[model samples]
Target: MSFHVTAEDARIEVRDNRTILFARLRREDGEWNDASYELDQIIGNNDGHFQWGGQNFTETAEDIRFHPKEGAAEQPILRARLRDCNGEFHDRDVNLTEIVENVNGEFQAKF
Candidate 1:
């Protein structure tokens, strides 16, 4: 199935030398009220955080649509590595099967 996304906001954070991903996906529904989304995840050791226009919100409107991070990859991806629940550290990954491409400020994904 596929779904639609109108607008979204994404930003990066840092603590303990780790990059925390903060994304808020705003879905515009004409027939009803708007919707919201989130992906509170801590990625690898990438600390690229800064304030934008004196505001903490890094609103990437004309650049990226919904998918977090800035990359024009064919199959969109966000790399992450964390220890397993079984106390083993390995090369872990996140929602990697989906593809997010720039389509003039619009988003449509499949599952």
Candidate 2:
């Protein structure tokens, strides 16, 4: 399965190093019916949180199956990671397999 993403498809706004003010995903979905999406991010150190709108999301394979929005049937996979430059983050190409494997390994270790 592919995440189906392109360059310059993600944007985010963060403040105080812990708050996301705004975020937007550049992908267009005809069936997508909303101004924003409840995207999830689960990094190594940061406490995972949900932000509405983003081209991609981050997650560990351990909990990758969880949904950010309660009662939602499905979740969007992480298409790519946002690259940061001078405190500004932009959408960029990244190896999704690397991320998936990393998360999967972490999940395996807990067993």
Candidate 3:
């Protein structure tokens, strides 16, 4: 069993056996582009022993508030950096509002 988060432009599914992230990018003119990636294939475990994406992360409520950065209002870009269990690093930035909209109400927590 797994939990799925549905957004206008993306879908985040929690499945430890085979986790995947699907996204659809929209152009300024409304053109759409789609892509999908497997989390395990992209970032494998460091120890490779056990885990569970079955925790139903979407069923609970939690706070995700962050302190506003100086001049953050003027600069709309939000930087995201993540280091997976495999020691793979990812860094990028996008419109804050767009990012929030994509993951809001999505399953992002675990027990």
Candidate 4:
């Protein structure tokens, strides 16, 4: 699958990072929601976290969502990592695959 950001939601999604990920939302009064959405960053990293006029958040490995960080900027934005759990972190990817495969395979028979 491909990664994409939507203007309607005002959020960018980083897919494949995990089976479940989160999305940051901006409010009308120039504030962000503390909660996040459960999504999948199956393609890329969520490198788009614009604060508009509030706080800044960073995207981390465990959760591909916004996490508050200290910094200087009128409005906080998203600063993401280029890579995921690959190479040295190969186990993470493998474990994810195994879980998905075992659970899915139990329901659907391979032909």
Candidate 5:
């Protein structure tokens, strides 16, 4: 089982195995696709260089709300920085709505 989302109306598979979740953003090109990367966070330099063709991609893992993609044509970018390597870093006190924000509303939370 997995969560598949369409970016640029492109369909990509998102699989969560528990410890590590796979975040793959792809552009649909008919029978083939172009994938981005697997990460819990989006990486980029402060400069205007988007190394992987983009920067600060709002991935799905950090999304706290369980919004479905079926009816949602778009969503607001929201995510909190892990700031730590431990999975337990996000505790019960973590307020996702407040912790996350947006940049051009690029990242959307569809849990």
Candidate 6:
């Protein structure tokens, strides 16, 4: 009975003069995933990061895009197929920070 499909609940907030909305990402176990995340906005940092063997790994995405119109603002806005090694030779996936960002790309929308 949830949104499911790599997405869970929704996000809406107010920051100064900005209205924000986005989707929530969680593991299949019904909780926030914390093993990896996206990082579209960075200041001398990698695009993303992940965990494996008790260490952090960098991640990125491909086919990323943006749509200025013809879409609902409440649902997950950010869209991309990330590129990482978490699912390659690792025994873990990842998680999402309470606040969404392009880092994990699990579900991040701020506009």
**Whose lDDT is greatest here?**
3
Candidate 5 residue-wise lDDT, 1-111, digit = tens: 223434342222233511111222433333423333322243321222212222332231233222223345443222222223233323111222222222232243322
Question: Relative to the unseen true structure, what is the C-alpha lDDT of residue 59 in candidate 4, on a scale of 0 to 100?
Answer: 30
Off by over 4 Å in 1: 1-38, 41-73, 96-111
For model 5, give the 10-residue run with minimal summed lDDT. 91-100
> How close is every model to the real structure, measured as TM-score?
0.29, 0.21, 0.29, 0.21, 0.22, 0.23
Please write out the lDDT profile of model 4 over residues 13-102, one tens digit for every residue.
444434232333345555444333322322223233221211122234333333222233222123333333342211111111111111
Off by over 4 Å in 4: 1-26, 29-34, 42-68, 74-86, 90-111
lDDT agreement with native, every candidate: 0.30, 0.26, 0.34, 0.27, 0.27, 0.32
The local distance difference test score of model 3 is: 0.34
Tell me model 6's lDDT, rounded to 2 decimals. Answer: 0.32
Identify the runs in model 5 with alpha carbons over 4 angstroms from their true place: 1-29, 32-73, 76-78, 81-111
TM-score of 1: 0.29
Q: What is the lDDT of residue 102 in candidate 2?
A: 17
| Candidate 4: residue 83 lDDT (0-100) | 31
Report the lDDT tens digits of candidate 3 across residue range 1-111.
111212243434545544455566444565555655443332222222122223222112112112212242433332333344575545433332222322222323322
RMSD value for candidate 4? 15.7
lDDT of 2 by residue, 1-111 (tens): 224231122222332332121222332342321122222332222123322232234421122232122224223233233434334343332222222221211211111
RMSD of 6: 13.5
Instruction: Please identify which of the two predictions, 5 or 6, would achieve the higher TM-score against the true structure.
Output: 6
- Higher-scoring candidate on lDDT, 3 or 5: 3
Tens digits of lDDT, candidate 6, 14-81: 32322233444454566664333223231111233222122112223332332222133323333333
